[PDB]
Amino acid sequence: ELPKEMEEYFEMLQREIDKAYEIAKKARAQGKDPSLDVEIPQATDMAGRVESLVGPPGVAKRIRELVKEYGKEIAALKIVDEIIEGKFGDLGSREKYAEQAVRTALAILTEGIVSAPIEGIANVKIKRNTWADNSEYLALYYAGPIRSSGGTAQALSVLVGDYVRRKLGLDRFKPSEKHIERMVEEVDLYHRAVTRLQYHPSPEEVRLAMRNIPIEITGEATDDVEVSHRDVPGVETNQLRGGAILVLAEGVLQKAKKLVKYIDKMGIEGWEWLKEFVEAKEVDMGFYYSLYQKFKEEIAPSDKYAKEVIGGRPLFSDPSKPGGFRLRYGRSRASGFATWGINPATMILVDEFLAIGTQLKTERPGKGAVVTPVTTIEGPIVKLKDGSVLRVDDYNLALKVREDVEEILYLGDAVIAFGDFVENNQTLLPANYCEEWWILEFVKALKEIYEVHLEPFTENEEESIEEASDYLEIDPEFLKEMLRDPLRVKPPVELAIHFSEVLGIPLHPYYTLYWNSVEPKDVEKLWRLLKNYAEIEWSNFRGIKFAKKIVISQEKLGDSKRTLELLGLPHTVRDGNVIVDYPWAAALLTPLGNLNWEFMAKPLYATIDIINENNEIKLRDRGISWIGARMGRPEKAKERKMKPPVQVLFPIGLAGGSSRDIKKAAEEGKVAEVEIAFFKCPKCGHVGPEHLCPNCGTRKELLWVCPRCNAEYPESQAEGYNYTCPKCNVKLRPYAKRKIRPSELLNRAMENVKVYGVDKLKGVMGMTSGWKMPEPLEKGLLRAKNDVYVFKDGTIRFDATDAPITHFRPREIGVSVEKLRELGYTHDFEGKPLVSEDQIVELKPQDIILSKEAGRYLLKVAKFVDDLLEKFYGLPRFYNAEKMEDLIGHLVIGLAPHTSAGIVGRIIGFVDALVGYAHPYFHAAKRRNCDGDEDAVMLLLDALLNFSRYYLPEKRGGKMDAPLVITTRLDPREVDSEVHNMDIVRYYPLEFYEATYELKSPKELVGVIERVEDRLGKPEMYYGLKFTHDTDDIALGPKMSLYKQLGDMEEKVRRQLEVAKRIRAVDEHGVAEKILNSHLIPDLRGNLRSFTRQEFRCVKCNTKFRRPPLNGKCPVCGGKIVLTVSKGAIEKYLGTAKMLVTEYNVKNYTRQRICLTERDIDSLFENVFPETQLTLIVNPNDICQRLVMA
DNA sequence: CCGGGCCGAGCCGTGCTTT
DNA sequence: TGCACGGCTCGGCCCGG
């Protein structure tokens, strides 16, 4: 099976997990906790997760064998059949069987990670068609959490319900027309008043869907809005069913393609209507002129990403505008899942709005990505204040020259993986000329002419190197260097021209200017001026002449200076002369044949076409495909704290005040009345909210109370009574409203842990669970002492943005080679022994690289855990850390905010960025996509000691974010489906570049380029992956977004508009400000309409009155009444809006809207705030009065 | 010396909508 | 995508009559 390294890796991981689990089990046995054992079982594959989460017991082996035999979908269907026939045990009525089968099937088809089977499916019930035939059918009730599951999960739930209804021998749902009207109205109102829904079903589609769904999709109410078609038969509510309508909109409708694919694979009949719906939904010119025409015909610009711009979030490029982001096909070391590659220079030169991990909304491949530094690609070309043009391909140069920038001519490159085009099914765009194409042409031409076999990006035999160098008359060392790293070693321009002359290949892409960005008439005028009024110095190299310098005066150059800037030619202006220096004089004069032939404009021809037709040295289009993007959602790395911060899960009520301070209530002697669980000692008879009796140190028993007669029974007594009151007749409850004196409890806790010096200790107003079991106060004291905070289930968590990585360097993460060899790494990614810190090593699937904020916080968490173990439990310390670098080799838990299972990872290094780097398999095993998502990490021992299932809220969305099970091993076969499209090749073949020019589809050449899916099953899914582009440093560049250092809204808008003004391909003046105004106008108009219909509230109480009390004071107390929508909330964005209107070009519609909004704001308060104040000076150059008087 | 003026934390509420 | 903005109270310190 697996080789002798992956097995050792997984064995060591299991050994460490066992080492932690032993201590966690030993500590929990002493009885100071809700349970006497750990409450997080460990799974290993999908069957274990499904068995632990939904059951029924014993299903694991059956799932295993069925998956081995048939597959995934077929195995799910056979499991459903076996459950229905009753192999795993008798359950009860048909409803129980239906619920169990649907839950297990939805868990199997999902791989048992996301909590849709546990949370979304609230209930399954059988209903009768009393309106038509009195026949039976099946219905599904969807709760609130189903909106977080995803379209695939929702659609698969619908399909599983259909299959179970078919196999139960039940009839079809037959809706009345009023049902259709009610559902259409529900969808429309939900979109209008709640959310955008990210999908708009047309009413015809909704009617068709209702007419052709064999099950009833309903549920409880999730929004406080009534409907019109009330009292519909079979419906027990008259409010919005958000879960059901969201399922219907974003499931079967938004993801019909995947649903019909699943139906075809699954062999399910009766869904032909969906298949039909899906199939209905589905002269002498120049080469480059025709290519541009076909590009514009087939692939069309998209504006969806730029339909809205928030104040403070800049737009970096208009849709498919030349001068924006240059598209490059490839995958870097730390990109590929859904992220982009960006040079740090263009991160700096946009006022540092972009930072490592900052999300942005893209146009072509998908929608959204995360930026990552790649120093191997090109940067911006900028125009300075004195008129010079520079190529800022370097980070330090960008820092140096930042203040002199006048305009950004070109914005730089963006590396996008080929697997991102396959996943989103996007037509391939023609590829800009690059070094990774030139090197392939070079080696192919060398082989064709001289019959020498060489290969880029690797090491070749010495005989071939010597033969090629003898033929080409070059240094063999330089040939080896260039073939090894074509992206960093470039020949001098004269050598490039000599290569083009001899071998017959286009010019090196580094020395090609953007010729096709100008018209041939501009080049005609420029050629005339160069021939007439220029002084050029020539040179020689192997009989090849080339220019060395051009000096032409500014007046003689005239208005053709703009042409030199559009070609991206670096020059300088001195004492009236424009000077073009050595490397960039031949880059301009060689294509034009050194003025030997006359450039002449032609119709239906492009500049490169004319150059190729007339010249001997040939060229390729260097910029033809451009991309647009827009900023959104800056990067994040911060701890998790509840809406009011909490340090212990202990209810205090109103005694503690506004901050729920337990210590303040204790020090004032207050007595609080709250609902808690009381425990009673069997031997002596102590009573109170504690798990151990202080008198004797023995475990107590929970007390059960009668809701009607308040009779208390111990757990042993209530066990026989079947948890029902014999004297009364009501089901018991474990909690009742009781009285507590905080002083005694706090003093006992302080004496217990010897922690007396704590200032504040926050609790909760009321426990949300059904048991209302409280937490020990000693844990709260230690958390307060060590400055950490608690979560809803008792764990301490840290939230960060996720980014991918496959290969690392021992110096980027600050780890010595000896430590790495101790961890288990012994070779670099090419087979050589690991001896240096500059070699590239490959990352094992479950190794993570934390940030430094995360390390700083986890140091406090580890200190708290050590204090807990030493003081509360009386056991030796575990971590023993004094610096963040002492946590290396310790295990964490990763958890997405919508799943119920975790995955174990290992710490190996730290970076100085606000992102969480990890393997692509690690992020996919949490059902995450890596284009803006944020997840959590917690120490394994902390979760083991602290997590409990008795602190979980009792509503439906209470089991989300909880590690009910953890996975110990990684299986790439059952992680996700988007990560199966990634690339594992060192370089793209020549066929890919040649096929991009034909505008093919990525499905045609899916076999040419190796992907992850091509390796599934075989042992080398963990073994060898590769990348295309290298990086000097993985965390180089700005680290914090500038958006987080601006306070006012006006300042944000001004900075964003300056940024938009600098960039050439944005066109701020009329679209940026207008689309921005369509973000402040909703705020203004929507706050004036809520001032005239608002509810009032009391300062002391929380009582809300829908109309003001007519005595002016709170009827139930003595406090005063305050508004909920103040007067200053309406007109907070009025000044910025007026500035935007008066400064920039907006259509008269928006200007009139703003003027009338101001007039309406000043007219509603006409007789409550009269203008009794005169003034000295008036007319501050306003715009409203000017518009009125004009 | 004893009484105010003032800051700095905290905790609440709110973000287009034809008849 | 949700966060970003306004307003009310309540002590802890100066600083002055």
Ligand SMILES: [Mg+2]
């Ligand atoms: Mg995502």
Ligand SMILES: [Zn+2]
């Ligand atoms: Zn006792």
Ligand SMILES: [Zn+2]
């Ligand atoms: Zn009773």
Ligand SMILES: [Zn+2]
């Ligand atoms: Zn009141």
